Structure 1
Amino acid sequence: MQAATVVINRRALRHNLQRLRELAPASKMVAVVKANAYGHGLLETARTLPDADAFGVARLEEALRLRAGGITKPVLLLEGFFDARDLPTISAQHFHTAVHNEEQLAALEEASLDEPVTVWMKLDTGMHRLGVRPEQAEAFYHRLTQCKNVRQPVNIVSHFARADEPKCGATEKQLAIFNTFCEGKPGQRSIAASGGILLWPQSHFDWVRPGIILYGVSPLEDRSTGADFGCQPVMSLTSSLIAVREHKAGEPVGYGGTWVSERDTRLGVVAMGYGDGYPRAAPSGTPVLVNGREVPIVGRVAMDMICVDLGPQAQDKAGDPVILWGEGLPVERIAEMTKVSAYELITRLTSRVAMKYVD
């Protein structure tokens, strides 16, 4: 019938972008669409959001697919470029780039481009992933200022490591470091993504980079959902039953006989598995909606199939609609039940699901 299908709500997506402008009314928006737009579709998510001030990607590849698809809006390379030979491209495509290491800076200093490139110097303010450390930042920053190939002024970007943990002073320390370096400097400032936007109004500055929350999903693991912030869930992972079978008490289900029935019942088989992106870690009891009502997963999640307990006289039939997460079942709820981060749930899906866009 219909199998593994990801349904993307274009109206929810536009709503969230506008909703986020209301939360950060003095900041421009970098719609973060990396990793196939967190599973919602790189190009379609961008086509949906022409109001974005820019689009953010992880890799140069992603930026080029945007251009290839007709996106004209500025694209920000959050990780910068990996090869000095890519600068002519980046210049001609009008891609904005982060600059975090000596290789990139030296590259910019000796390249010969027909046009200078807007840059966002990435400062390491405490996460210690990418970026120039405080003691090397000033000298590094000054070189970018002297580059004929760098469009002036140079902008400043950083990222939070624990913005979702308001109780520890990590975020305030990163802000302290961020603010100290930006003092007296021109050029746009940006450090906040979903968590910074929602919980830290002092971190909005000139540009904010909504990612997870843009898709109506919460960046926090406190069982809050996108709706807690007025953002609507964009994605629905759906499928269908391919079988409804009789089952006896005492009989196990699935690999390892992991689950045993204590009653005669009817089981439903869903055309969904980890070969589609659904977490194999999902325990028996995890909720799924069959014909709009919640039923539990029973036994191990397999590569292409998932079994659920329908009840002894259920009436559900093969071909009926199944919702892995969507309307009536937030992905955050799944995240909680399976202990899998919502970020990974919506993002680590395979090419086997169909993509569908509505309204």
Structure 2
Amino acid sequence: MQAATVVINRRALRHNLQRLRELAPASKMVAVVKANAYGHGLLETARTLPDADAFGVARLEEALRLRAGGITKPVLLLEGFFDARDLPTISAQHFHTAVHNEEQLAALEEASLDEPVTVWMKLDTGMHRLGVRPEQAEAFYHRLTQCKNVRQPVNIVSHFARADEPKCGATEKQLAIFNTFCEGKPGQRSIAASGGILLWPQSHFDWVRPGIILYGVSPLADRSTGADFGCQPVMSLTSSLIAVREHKAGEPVGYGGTWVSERDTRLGVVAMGYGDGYPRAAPSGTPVLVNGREVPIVGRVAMDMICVDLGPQAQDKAGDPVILWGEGLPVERIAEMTKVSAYELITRLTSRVAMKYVD
């Protein structure tokens, strides 16, 4: 049998890259594949995409696994290097690197590398997470232009904190700061990720960094899916029923007796739980497809099972196909229901689920 499994549609990956090239026609693409490619598989997502102009990661650990798998494209270390000793590996492997502190800068100033590196000076434009603050960037930037160990020109990168909230002037204030600093300077400019791409065409610049939207899921703080932008659900979280049992009115199902039935019915048990990555927070009523027909979750979601209400004479039975989200059921619909972010839903999965790749 099949319990739990993530089916990855390679043909949809393929298409949202293109579809994103159509939305940001004058910008190069940095396919963001950090965190095991948002739960879709780091190496397999990269291999699905010989077209990305580059690949973005969080950590080096992650870039090095690309290389190990045979991926040859430029890989962008979005957060940089964490230790000055990895700078020889960086230049060897031809990684590009963000530089946000004076430890990473100082480390490039002094290191003796065989080849210079390509760098992006992270500028803090309003997120206040990583990056050099404005009042500090002009001097930091100038030191990078004088490194013989950095490739000229120095590129400039930044990130939006609230691009999915078009009504607050957040984004437009970051853009103002970004534009002021990049005035008169060569080399290139990122600042846009999924939101900036979809919603702010004035912050496409030279390179855009699609992450969540790449996978056909939406960045947005509302009920838009990837299909709202012509982008196609990459992932399908699937499993199977391992039991179909009789149940009676007034009887609770499961831990804490969270749900009590008002009628005699039949309950289905799914080989899926939080030990696989399915949200334990999922409330009774959350939709799940059993044989393609929606049924509600009844009870607490356990570590490796989920109960659903099939009906008093349903004909489903152990072994039948279950879809937690995918074709027929977006992850955005499971996010609105659960109250969990689609970003977390597709990404915080464990190693217990099998990975399948299709097309």
TM-score (norm 1): 1.00
SS at match of 1:224: coil
1:259-318 CA-partner distances (Å, limit 9, x unpaired): 000000000000000000000000000000000000000000000000000000000000
SS at match of 2:205: coil
| 1:301 and 2:275 are equivalent in the alignment | no
Preserved CA contact (<8 Å) 2:27 2:207: yes
Equivalent residue, structure 2, for 1:311: 311
1:51-89 CA-partner distances (Å, limit 9, x unpaired): 000000000000000000000000000000000000000
Equivalent residue, structure 1, for 2:38: 38
List, as ranges, runs of 4+ consecutive aligned residues in structure 1 with deviation greater than 4 Å.
Answer: none
Q: Distance in 2 between matches of 1:332 and 1:326?
A: 10
| 1:172 and 2:172 are equivalent in the alignment | yes
Preserved CA contact (<8 Å) 2:252 2:258: yes
Q: Distance in 1 between matches of 2:103 and 2:198?
A: 35
Q: Distance in 1 between matches of 2:223 and 2:41?
A: 25
Preserved CA contact (<8 Å) 2:194 2:213: yes
1:103-143 CA-partner distances (Å, limit 9, x unpaired): 00000000000000000000000000000000000000000
1:17-50 CA-partner distances (Å, limit 9, x unpaired): 0000000000000000000000000000000000
Question: CA shift at 1:222, angstroms?
Answer: 0.9
Equivalent residue, structure 2, for 1:289: 289
| 1:73 and 2:73 are equivalent in the alignment | yes
SS at match of 2:289: strand
Preserved CA contact (<8 Å) 2:273 2:306: yes
1:138-178 CA-partner distances (Å, limit 9, x unpaired): 00000000000000000000000000000000000000000
SS at match of 1:3: coil
Preserved CA contact (<8 Å) 2:297 2:306: yes
Equivalent residue, structure 2, for 1:271: 271
Question: CA shift at 1:221, angstroms?
Answer: 2.0
Q: Distance in 2 between matches of 1:5 and 1:126?
A: 39
Q: Distance in 2 between matches of 1:190 and 1:221?
A: 23
Q: Distance in 1 between matches of 2:337 and 2:8?
A: 23
Q: Distance in 1 between matches of 2:20 and 2:220?
A: 16
Preserved CA contact (<8 Å) 2:122 2:130: yes
TM-score (norm 2): 1.00
Q: Distance in 1 between matches of 2:183 and 2:15?
A: 35
Q: Distance in 2 between matches of 1:15 and 1:254?
A: 42
1:327-356 CA-partner distances (Å, limit 9, x unpaired): 000000000000000000000000000000
Q: Distance in 2 between matches of 1:202 and 1:188?
A: 15
Structure 1 vs Structure 2 CA RMSD: 0.2
Equivalent residue, structure 2, for 1:215: 215
Question: CA shift at 1:182, angstroms?
Answer: 0.1
Q: 1:231-250 residue pairs with structure 2 within 5 A? A: 231-250=231-250
Q: Distance in 2 between matches of 1:86 and 1:317?
A: 54
Preserved CA contact (<8 Å) 2:218 2:225: yes
SS at match of 2:118: strand
Q: Distance in 1 between matches of 2:216 and 2:195?
A: 13
1:196-242 CA-partner distances (Å, limit 9, x unpaired): 00000000000000000000000002110000000000000000000
Equivalent residue, structure 2, for 1:60: 60
Q: Distance in 2 between matches of 1:57 and 1:306?
A: 33
Equivalent residue, structure 1, for 2:254: 254
Q: Distance in 2 between matches of 1:61 and 1:258?
A: 42
Q: Flag structure 1 segments of 5+ consecutive residues without an equivalent.
A: none
SS at match of 1:253: coil
Q: Distance in 2 between matches of 1:20 and 1:202?
A: 15
SS at match of 2:237: strand
Preserved CA contact (<8 Å) 2:165 2:221: no
Q: Distance in 1 between matches of 2:297 and 2:249?
A: 17
Q: Distance in 1 between matches of 2:44 and 2:301?
A: 30
Question: CA shift at 1:188, angstroms?
Answer: 0.6
Q: Distance in 2 between matches of 1:187 and 1:348?
A: 36
SS at match of 2:277: coil
Q: 1:5-44 residue pairs with structure 2 within 5 A? A: 5-44=5-44
Counting aligned pairs with the same residue, the percent is 100
Q: Distance in 2 between matches of 1:78 and 1:40?
A: 19
Q: How many residues align?
A: 359
Q: Distance in 1 between matches of 2:134 and 2:234?
A: 39
Question: CA shift at 1:321, angstroms?
Answer: 0.1
Q: Distance in 1 between matches of 2:69 and 2:14?
A: 19
Question: CA shift at 1:8, angstroms?
Answer: 0.1
Equivalent residue, structure 2, for 1:144: 144
